[PDB]
Amino acid sequence: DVVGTLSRNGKPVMEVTSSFFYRGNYTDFENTFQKTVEPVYQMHIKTSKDIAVLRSKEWFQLDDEDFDLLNKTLTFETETEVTFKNANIFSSVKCFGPIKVELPTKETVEIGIVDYEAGASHGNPVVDFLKR
């Protein structure tokens, strides 16, 4: 699956997404990879256990560690690069991107980073977090 980005006067106009398939047997997991740009997710911090949850999350690094998250909407412009070992085992997962906050002006500013890196992963913890 290949992403064709077409642009006019420098600005992108349309995206052309095509999924192609080679029939047969491909055990080519060395050069097999997955480079998806994970969708952004908003997280509303109302309760005191929610900030406890995100601070319990290792991958949540902040620019200022003392930054209050109470009554804030945090967005994750996160993208994941996975190298494969098997059809399901991921030989290494690198899920990273800037964590921003919706300001009172509703402008977005980078206040933290997701810098998740792991070896023989069967999936992403961040994605499991997100579906619950």
Partner 1 sequence: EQGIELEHIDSKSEFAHRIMLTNILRMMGCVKKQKSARGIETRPAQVILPMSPNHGTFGGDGMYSESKLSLETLFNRWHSESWANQLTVCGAIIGWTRGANNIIAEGIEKMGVRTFSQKEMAFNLLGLLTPEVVELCQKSPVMADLNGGLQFVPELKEFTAKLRKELVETSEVRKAVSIETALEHKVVNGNSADAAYAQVEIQPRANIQLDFPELKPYKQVKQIAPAELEGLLDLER
Residues that bind partner 1 (CB under 8 A): 48-49, 52-53, 56, 118, 120-125, 127-129, 132
Nearer to partner 1, 102 or 130 (CB): 130
Structure tokens at 37: 């740009």
Nearer to partner 1, 106 or 132 (CB): 132
Q: How far is the CB of 58 from partner 1 (least distance, A)?
A: 9
Q: How far is the CB of 118 from partner 1 (least distance, A)?
A: 6
Nearer to partner 1, 108 or 121 (CB): 121
Nearer to partner 1, 62 or 118 (CB): 118
Q: How far is the CB of 120 from partner 1 (least distance, A)?
A: 8
